[PDB]
Design an enzyme around this catalytic site. Structure first.
Site, PDB file in Angstrom:
ATOM      1  N   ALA A   1      -3.366   4.126  -1.031  1.00  0.00           N
ATOM      2  CA  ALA A   1      -3.346   3.295   0.314  1.00  0.00           C
ATOM      3  C   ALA A   1      -4.629   2.853   0.773  1.00  0.00           C
ATOM      4  CB  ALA A   1      -2.469   4.171   1.329  1.00  0.00           C
ATOM      5  N   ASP A   2      -4.545   1.871   1.552  1.00  0.00           N
ATOM      6  CA  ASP A   2      -5.801   1.185   2.471  1.00  0.00           C
ATOM      7  C   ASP A   2      -6.005   1.705   3.655  1.00  0.00           C
ATOM      8  OD1 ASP A   2      -3.831  -0.746   0.985  1.00  0.00           O
ATOM      9  OD2 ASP A   2      -5.796  -1.060   0.094  1.00  0.00           O
ATOM     10  N   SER A   3      -6.960   1.189   4.111  1.00  0.00           N
ATOM     11  CA  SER A   3      -7.257   1.598   5.560  1.00  0.00           C
ATOM     12  C   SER A   3      -6.254   1.188   6.599  1.00  0.00           C
ATOM     13  CB  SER A   3      -8.576   0.784   6.004  1.00  0.00           C
ATOM     14  OG  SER A   3      -9.066   1.170   7.415  1.00  0.00           O
TER      15      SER A   3
END
Length: 78
Positions: A35-37
């Protein structure tokens, strides 16, 4: 045996819809989950509203692995 861990992990499993076993202290929602930030931020907010705490924005930057998010919520929980 953990009070906060079980909680955080549970919410993560019910929110993300993944396996609990994978939710380990050394589990990075960024890589481990890919996942990303964005995902990290969302999760942080959810936990913050769930427990009802108040943490800074930089906190989301310090929260990488499950242990981080959990330890944070537990720390602010007090």
């Amino acid at each position: 045996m953990s009070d906060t861990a079980e909680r955080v992990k549970k919410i993560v499993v019910e929110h993300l819809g993944v396996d609990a076993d994978k939710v380990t202290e050394g589990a990075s929602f960024i890589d481990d989950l890919g996942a990303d930030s964005l995902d990290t931020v969302e999760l942080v907010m959810a936990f913050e509203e769930e427990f009802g705490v108040e943490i800074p924005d930089d906190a989301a930057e310090t929260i990488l692995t499950v242990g981080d998010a959990v330890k944070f919520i537990d720390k602010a929980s007090a």
